């Protein structure tokens, strides 16, 4: 019925001359009298009305204004946090020995990378075992690259697309089995796909939920579409060229009832497993993929009609390779 | 020189009749007068001496006792949190609609699983696209299973072991390349291996750092060993039989200088990619693997001589398959 909000675990606070600092923002007005009790109260799970009844005492317009802002600013949340918010506090614990100019200079960055690729563990002793370089590895593994340019004219055949997604399907064989591992065998990653118009034979544009039990796509949304402004600038041409987008979504209901918060962590690992498994079948079918770290997931989540117990973990752009 | 402690982002607090509640524990004595200022002060990064100078005012033995306990209880920490602590607060946000008896009953669990494997997205419309089941998938992918019984007599040949780990090595080819994807191409997962005595041809028992630039093992620790009590009960026979253990470690210094906290999240995905990539080469070489979700990583971290900027993400047991 009514929405229940919690104090975000990712948000810590502090008093100021200016007001109450929560996260990276300072807040003003009534809220200064509300603390510390407001922090204690909000951790228990409370509605907006119960917050007003407990703290309003004065302009009820002025109180809704600061609550509206704590929801806007994600200090009060309705469900599990998406991964960006889960991890954000770790910035405050990592002491960075490099200069911030790594992020602003392709020349400073090119240097940081070559240094990290030649790193070694500090606690190493002066003994070594040189392994044999000779051995032969599967070509689907060794030739896989991050593909950022696709054939924008030839449609992905329905067979190729079907074959790609059968890597993620179920197999009934004395017991249900997948082609990839999963903590508890709970397989709590919901898989969704956005297909661009005319780019996949047999699949109208839209957002679809991949059902691994049927090996089917089930329509979710044909009204909205993904655009380039939903992508970080560095990725917009990748998206422009891609034929489809895969979205890996954690269903907390498929995991936390058994593993608690550790299941969310396990689902982040499982997201990698799925990406790697897909990326190998792709190379077999001369499909290219590119992982996307970040995107306007706030919008995608709304297009996919996700619930409080579902969050987007990862995204992948795909399509036929040129030539 | 001196150690600098931060208030753990994973820890929230509350006042009580009994005392100050921090995390799932209530604390007593001097600490009740120290709040709220102690919370504000500790977020900035402070030494033990500066804490004493600012709050002692009284029994300095009684103050070291509560600080010793806040460090023991991980309320005050020296670096990035390991994944279990990163995620733990999410339990407080997930509203569980199932009974807790899922965790205590193999019959309640067997039922929760079959229900989650037949789940569907709630926002689905009544349209479907049935994909072709026909397509053929690589056998290294389709036949891969979680292997929990190994040949404990035949040693993994040095060639097989070398070939397995070349999936994780670098390749100089106009530019440095790996066989698997990584955000920013920073490859911030340090790979370590524990080898049991007599179980891998050419590799003495011990902990080793895998250097992907040389394709070498570099000794870290031959004194300590992993034992069964370092494993969850459910996994102890898996470990007992395995020939070696792989540990995937996030080097925050190889990632956060560029991506901030998001690089830690990306490294959790990358851990999956690595596990899947390894698990495919393994199947090619008739090596079995099993992922381990949890283990006494507090001990392993010490055996690997990790620094504040390194945390263990995942573990894998491996060895030759029976017959
Ligand atoms: C992140 C992760 C953690 C896992 N942890 C464990 C574990 O602690 N113990 C275990 O026996 N298996 C573990 N597994 C293996 C799964 O139980 C297994 O993948 C699942 O039962 C499906 O079986 P399959 O690999 O044979 O398809 C783990 C898998 C993943 C992806
Ligand atoms: C978690 C993750 C996120 C990624 N995000 C992006 C991205 O946002 N943009 C991009 O161009 N590439 C992205 N990539 C691809 C990497 O940049 C790529 O794997 C790396 O440069 C190594 O190249 P290779 O795949 O050709 O070996 C991502 C990879 C991973 C594993």
Author numbering:
A (entry chain A), B (entry chain A): 2 to 324
Task: Recite the paper's sentences.
The bacillamide biosynthetic pathway is a common, three-protein system, with a decarboxylase that prepares an NRPS substrate, an NRPS, and an oxidase. The oxidase is shown to perform dehydrogenation of the thiazoline in the peptide intermediate while it is covalently attached to the NRPS, as the penultimate step in bacillamide D synthesis. The oxidase forms a stable complex with the NRPS and dimerizes it. We visualized co-complexes of the oxidase bound to the elongation module of the NRPS using X-ray crystallography and cryo-EM.
The structure of BmdC shows it to be a dimer of di-domain protomers. A single copy of BmdC is present in the asymmetric unit, and the adjacent symmetrically related copy completes the biological dimer. The small N-terminal domain contains 96 residues and features a winged helix–turn–helix motif (wHTH) with a very small β-sheet. A DALI41 structural similarity search reveals this domain to be similar to the precursor peptide recognition elements (RRE) in ribosomally synthesized post-translationally modified peptide (RiPP) processing enzymes with Z-scores ranging from 5.3 to 6.5 and rmsd values of 2.0–2.9 Å over 61–69 alpha carbons. BmdC contains a 45-residue loop segment between the RRE-like (RREL) and Ox domains, that wraps around the Ox domain of the other protomer. The loop contributes 1764.3 Å2 of the total 5777.3 Å2 per-protomer surface area buried by BmdC dimerization. The electron density maps showed very strong density for flavin mononucleotide (FMN). One protomer contributes to most of the side-chain interactions, with both the FMN phosphate, (through Arg145, Arg146 and Ser147) and the catalytic isoalloxazine rings (hydrogen bonding of Arg149 with FMN N1 and O2, Asn236 with N3 and O4, plus Gly294 with N5; analogous to interactions observed in flavin reductase P51). The conserved active-site Tyr260 points toward the FMN in each protomer. There is room for the thiazole ring to bind between this Tyr260 residue and the catalytic FMN N5 atom; a glycine from the crystallization buffer is observed occupying this site.
